[PDB]
């Protein structure tokens, strides 16, 4: 996005329960429609 | 506008006397965290804008810049300030005295952030300008 | 009175199948914060008051019963709820479907109680009954 | 016994802000499948035996009563639902939001191979706000 | 479970014999407006939906039905509830005791509604039957 | 069936914060007092017949069970009620917000003329919250 | 539906919420508008 | 020090031409309740800390003095604002663009030492200096 | 001090008596 | 209290405000 | 005197947040232009003379110093304008929020009938605050 | 130049918090004393040139302004200062946190035995909020 990391990408990074918590996953729209 | 300068000076003196190193330095931290819930960032996208904002904040005081990198093979947030406001002599090491006022600033900065969760440690590392204040950040 | 027992067992099935555990619990996280939204507890004093509080409330819908302990060396809210209702064989473990609602629903009920803008959250502790859940409730995120 | 009026209600609320209507509504005509696939009716051949069969599941759950009248014209069922459960303002009309969940369970409960029937469709159309008329056509 | 009944119809015997019935108007209006605080409708878009949430509400806890009615040349709201629960003879009519509960309940049931802003006042329109109670909301003037 | 649940902890709320906790304990003994003139035992001459008769009145109107004893010390009359209804978090201590309306009821029951313990005077004094003992004494 | 909408109802009633709730464009389509 | 003075006369102007009255007034609350959530006061307890903490936040800023009172016979707070900034002649009186800032700052500042969830209103009272802003807080919707 | 609280405040926003009527009986 | 911490204490627990800086002062 | 500093931050955020970036842009670029139409430079018949006329107006408002450069493969004008003033994290770059309103103000500045500028229309392109924009006929 | 009054408030707030009032109060008179150390003023003999000296330090600092006047009834001083330094609510009255502070220094300065007030003792007393009043007695 800008040549920085996000912080989510920063929370990720360091650990703890945020890198699963800030894991990528669909919104209920998407992940009914893809279904 | 009042000077606080030669009162922080003789603060610093009578705490350090008075008490011992770690007191004055949790006690600093607690200040530092109440600093940043009177003024606080809003909530960034990436470790530029963060850093942005925090300089802004900074810049509202007066209290130096800081410079913001993530470390993804130590798995950390190094934090760089400087121009650290100087009150006396004393600190460790000298003319840092408000050295721990950021471990607990930039720890209620960044914990403030969407994504975060847990407990942190904000440490400050122990060629370097006196008043550069270099602190990692971890999970706990 | 119509029955929503069968109902919910086809719905927890479905929604399962076609959508992951995360964005499900998600959902329900948001429907529990929502019926918080709906029912609320009086501004109470102390634990035990906000405890007969909580429990009159689940007991209008009959949702269970709670206890509240508030742990200083974990400075944290150690909520137990006994008798979560049962929508067949789904969540981990089976027959603990809504406990995402819970969390959200003691989210919302605690927070009700604090300051105007606080940052905690309610996470389940994943030989405890089946249908009995503890949930700790402490920030968001904190520095030292 | 548990009460989920209020889940429900809420439930229905997320949804609707989440998701929107149409695939609300196929969601709800799987849920309604998939309930069919819990409960069955017996195998009837006249169309009075499989409203009898019919009002007596819905007793048995506890959602409504049914009518079905075969029409002499174009071969179609008329299916008029009464005393549908009723969970908040969510729905089209409001309060009929679990009709598709109806849909479907009419779907898999008429079109049955052992039957009369085997092979139709449901299509949703002074009618009371909990009344939901279906129509079954090949 | 516990019954209230025999309790309630003492109580308001005597709450009337002991204060007035000014006195325990504005009591049991307060009651209405902390019961509405207790349990609240979401946030409603037109009038059926919200009767259709209030209606809700009221059977949540057994109290009765209600409508609701727009009066433009009026410029109020009428609030028609039914099957008002009953608690002894107490009340102007007879056996209506619990009757500024509502007033207090739908005044805050209604004014929490996104779009009201102000002072608002409910009142009760004093053929129907005996537990039917009608209200007028206006703004306060 | 209306319920007076809610109804009830919002009144016994509004009531504390209004009146206080002696003129709200007063209020309720008198409206105990009240309730004793509604529902009355018959005139029983034993510590036990009144006992079944008590408990058969607090089942008629679903509000616990109650046992009384006859302490020889001073002739006095010991009461415990358990599973008093719950208002609320109102009370001392909570939930314990009935109390001197059990007070009131047990005063109008007890001390009838007709039977054996009619110069009595009603006294609240490891249990369960809900149970409540008073003492009886002439 | 036919019935009115919360927001026509507190118009309706007066006070000034009929004035707060004068339907007005937003920021954006007051922008693109003029 | 970068001077903003011109380019906020400017920009009032150009907002003022483009879009209505109302329009600019919702945003500017907005930026008002942005600016609030940037810089909060502690946790006060009564309404002269209150006013110090707020006056202090102000001078951080410089954008005037504030004065509280309530007013129990009225139900409300009133606010008196004083020396709020001047850009241009923008604004209702002219001069006052920026007071629909004040009632979002307020709001929130003021709304941050009450309960959970709150519903309260900061309206301007539409003698008094030019820059001096009258408004008063009071709950949303009340009923009788 | 000398200044009604915080909380003073928004109880009197957001809020014969019957404690006067009680005791007069 | 009623032999149970109250609200105001909770929250302030879970904040974390349940040698020290008294007691290094007091020592002095 | 007041600062201004956290209202510009929060207005835009609350700005790109609500419209977006080109309602932004524009909007933003008819501040330049209506600020231009309030302090104007003398009419100069040479870059030099401009870019003097232009840097004293910059310093009257404290919003930076700027290079004019006279490009010969086109005629074209190459405006560096640094030290732009930084209101946050908005913009793109960040920090770069106000650069638009520089398009409103050079365009307004040099393009002037009774200087020897007239015409060429202004086209946005280093430090985070330097912001490089063109002048082509 | 750096802004240490969002700093002073939040560390009077912790302080307050943890201490209390009269450690605080010792603290803050013990930081005044050892200011006193720092800078200090020429001996003065006279009540109206150590007023000026005293003047020019607290200009020197910023730390407002002061009067002193020699009370004939009883040989003691009455010192009043305005525009002490205001950092929050913290104090007694709120926005007077800094007044211990004044003590101390004005027991250090005023105290000089090479001038003619060297036994002389702090007591802290329609006033403004930022003026303090304190009264030194041999």
Redesign the interface.
């Known amino acids: 996005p800008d040549g920085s990391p996000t912080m989510a990408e920063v929370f990720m990074t360091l650990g703890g329960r945020a890198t699963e918590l800030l894991s990528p996953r669909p919104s209920l729209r998407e992940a009914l429609l893809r279904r | 506008?009042?000077?606080?300068?030669?009162?922080?000076?003789?603060?610093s003196?009578?705490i350090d006397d008075?008490?011992?190193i770690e007191?004055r330095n949790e006690?600093l931290?607690?200040?530092?965290?109440?600093?940043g819930?009177?003024?606080?960032?809003?909530p960034?996208?990436?470790?530029?804008?963060?850093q942005?904002?925090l300089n802004?904040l900074l810049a509202?005081?007066?209290?130096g810049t800081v410079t913001l990198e993530?470390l993804?093979e130590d798995?950390?947030?190094r934090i760089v300030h400087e121009n650290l406001?100087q009150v006396g002599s004393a600190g460790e090491p000298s003319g840092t005295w408000?050295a721990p006022?950021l471990e607990?600033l930039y720890?209620?900065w960044?914990?403030?952030?969407?994504?975060?969760?847990?407990?942190?440690?904000?440490t400050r590392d122990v060629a370097v300008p006196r008043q550069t204040i270099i602190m990692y950040?971890?999970?706990?």
Not at chain 2, 1 to 11: E, G, H, R, V, Y
Not at chain 2, 29 to 35: A, D, P, S, T, Y
Request: charged residues 20%; glycine residues 10%; aromatic residues 8%.
């Open positions: 506008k009042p000077d606080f300068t030669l009162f922080l000076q003789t603060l003196w009578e008075q008490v011992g007191v006690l931290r607690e200040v530092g965290r109440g600093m819930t009177r003024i606080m960032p809003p960034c996208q990436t470790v530029d804008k963060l942005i904002e802004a509202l005081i007066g209290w993530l993804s798995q950390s947030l406001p408000l006022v607990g720890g209620r960044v914990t403030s952030q969407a994504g975060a969760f847990g407990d942190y440690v904000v950040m971890r999970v706990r």
